[PDB]
């Protein structure tokens, strides 16, 4: 189990999004987070463009598993994945470890593009202008509103305090049990985990655990 | 001003990166709280650009309660206004001269562009960047400025964005009041490098003050 360890990339065709109607879809098997990018033609530079992107939005995944399409089997693409430490897995187009996680992403994605499309009247092909914006809006509904992927691979939570530190006590040794709150003008506000005491210490006398 | 937590207040603004031409017009949005960044390439600064930009930043960081940009036509425009309002996002215009604290973004631009310099010259493009590995490079720049801490810090913007640290109480400070004297009774909530959110111990009032006007209140209790 776990986010950013295994992804399922795959291209799909959405006519409504042409010219660039070739859609690259990456899904995180764990989080269920989606990343799609438009393309004129499914090629090696396409996938590599797509992935670099999904990496910027979801993070570096340990491995991606795609079909045996030339765009993934290619030389460049493999050198690429290897230049990033990303394991690759060309599974047969049926199941081969399961690959229907993405196809439901495509359905949700395309179906979503249908409503966002006809919502603004475009009963067919979508204007090259409001194309990115509509696609982008689909990502936001697919990832932020409950049906949550980001609320699953990000794990949003508010932290009441900061990271644990070891401050330097008058004896010259470094004492554990403190946590840093705020930094200001070279001093650090630190809070003792046992007494709840808060004191300001020089940045120099504070080091992490 | 700045935000005391993610998706509270954003600072959008366009910049010019020659190396990224044709589409050398860059739209950059920063989360004043998180310090997370999102940039998108553009051929020309327009209303559909901003709205393209924002839609995207929203997909990556989430829906922000408000964005504060300058008086550029692309933001003051009709569509843009109707757009922000169709999203429930408050808007706030200012002066291009970084007016007040909209300088949080200017640092984004510098870090971004400087970052594109290295990633550029690293692969040899000592000048203009080929239309092909353009997105790629840009994207890699986001990944560095987001998923990897930057400067003195232990957490990355992407981390402080979904797992923000919002203080309950906050340590004591002495802020400089209008008389020039340093007043006690205040505690710092967020201590930016630009401004600090500070809370009165007596009235519970919260106001933003220049970081230079606040100092640690070493007078332990």
Pair B169, B108 in one domain: no
CA-CA distance, A14 to A25, in Å (whole number)?
12
Q: How far apart are CA A67 and CA A8, in angstroms?
A: 9
DSSP alpha helices (H): ranges in chain B? 47-61, 73-76, 78-87, 103-122, 135-146, 157-162
Neighbouring C-beta atoms of residue A95, cutoff 10 Å = 9
Of the candidates A108, A29, A61, A20, the residue with the CA atom closest to the CA atom of residue B147 = A61
Whether residues B171 and A156 touch (CB distance < 8 A) is answered with: no
C-alpha R_g of chain B: 19
My answer on whether B149 and B176 are in the same domain is no
Q: Smallest Cβ distance to B163: which of A45, A156, A199?
A: A156
H or E stretch at A10: strand A7-13
Nearest 5 degrees, angle CA B35-CA B36-CA B40? 130
Tell me the backbone φ, ψ of residue A108, rounded to 5 degrees: -60, -45
Pairing of strands B195-200, B182-191: antiparallel
Same domain, A195 and A161: yes
CA angle A161, A165, A169 (to 5 degrees): 125
Do residues A10 and A91 touch, judged by C-beta distance below 8 A? no
Q: In what order do the strands lie in the sheet with B206-210?
A: B206-210, B195-200, B182-191, B172-176, B214-216
What's B5's domain CATH number?
A: 3.30.420.10
Which residue from A minimizes the CA distance to B214?
Answer: A184
Domain count, chain A: 2
Q: Which residue matches tokens 């990832």? A: A143
Check: CB of residue A142 under 8 Å from CB of residue A109: yes
B217 annotated binding-site participant: no
Crossing angle between the packed helical segments A44-58 and B135-146, to the nearest 10 degrees: 20
Verify that B117 and B211 share a domain, yes or no. Answer: no
CB within 8 Å of B15: residues ≥ 6 apart = B26, B28, B109, B112, B113
Query: Does one domain contain both B110 and B199?
Result: no
B58–A136 C-beta distance less than 8 A: yes
For testing contact with chain B, the best of A4, A83, A182, A205 (most B CBs within 10 A): A182
Residues A7, A82: one domain? yes
B57 to chain A: closest CA residue? A136
- Three-state DSSP class for residue A7: strand
Residue at a domain's end among B134, B164, B194: B164
Q: How many CB pairs under 8 A join A and B?
A: 115
**Residue of chain A whose Cα is closest to the Cα of B40:** A132
Distance CA A93, CA A69 (A): 9
CB contact under 8 A, B170 and A181: yes
Flag if A59 and B147 touch (Cβ within 8 Å).
yes
- Contact between chains at B136 and A187 (C-beta distance less than 8 A): no
**How many angstroms away from the CA of B118 is the closest CA of chain A?**
17
Alpha-carbon gap: A64 to the closest alpha carbon of chain B (Å): 18
Residues B201 and B158 grouped into a single domain = no
Same domain? B22 vs B83? yes
DSSP states along A11-75: EEE-GGG-SS-EEEEEEETTT--EEEEEESS--HHHHHHHHHHHHHHH---SEE---S-HHHHSH
Domain boundary, last residue among A156, A175, A199: A156
What CATH number does the domain containing A176 carry?
2.30.30.10
Question: How far is residue A101 from each of residues A33, A40, A109, A133, A175, measured CA to CA in Å?
Answer: 11, 24, 12, 25, 49
Q: Are residues B179 and B101 in the same domain?
A: no
Specify whether A52 is located in the same domain as A33: yes
Q: Which residues of B touch A154 (CB under 8 A)?
A: 162-163
Task: Please indicate, yes or no, whether residues A31 and A43 belong to a single structural domain of this protein.
Answer: yes
Does B155 share its domain with B54? yes
The approach used to solve this structure was: X-ray
The closest of B167, B172, B168, B170 to B184, measured between CA atoms, is B172
Domain containing residue B70: 1-164
C-alpha closest to that of A201 among A209, B175, A191:
A191
In the sheet with A164-168, reading across from the earlier edge strand, the strands are A198-202, A187-192, A174-184, A164-168, A206-208
The answer to whether B6 and B161 have CB atoms below 8 angstroms apart is yes
Interacting residues of B122 by C-beta distance below 8 A, sequence separation 6+: none
């Amino acid at each position: 189990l776990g986010p950013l360890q295994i992804w399922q990339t795959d291209f799909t065709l959405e006519p409504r999004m042409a010219p660039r109607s070739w859609l690259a879809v990456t899904v995180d098997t764990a989080s269920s987070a989606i990343v799609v990018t438009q393309h004129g033609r499914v090629t090696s530079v396409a996938v590599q463009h797509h992935w670099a992107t999904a990496i910027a939005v979801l993070g570096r995944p340990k491995a991606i598993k795609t079909d045996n399409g030339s765009c993934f089997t290619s030389k460049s693409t493999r050198e690429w994945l290897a230049r990033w430490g990303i394991a690759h897995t060309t599974g047969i187009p049926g199941n081969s470890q399961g690959q229907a996680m993405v196809e439901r992403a495509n359905r949700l994605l395309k179906d979503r593009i249908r409503v966002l499309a006809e919502g603004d009247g475009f009963m067919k092909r979508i204007p090259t202008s409001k194309q990115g914006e509509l696609l982008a809006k689909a990502m936001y509904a697919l990832n932020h509103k409950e049906r949550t992927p980001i609320q699953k691979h990000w794990r949003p939570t508010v932290l009441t305090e900061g990271p644990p530190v070891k401050i330097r006590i008058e004896t010259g040794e470094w004492e554990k049990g403190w946590n840093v709150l705020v930094w200001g003008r070279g001093y650090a506000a630190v809070k003792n985990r046992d007494t709840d005491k808060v004191i300001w210490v020089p940045s120099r006398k504070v080091k992490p655990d």
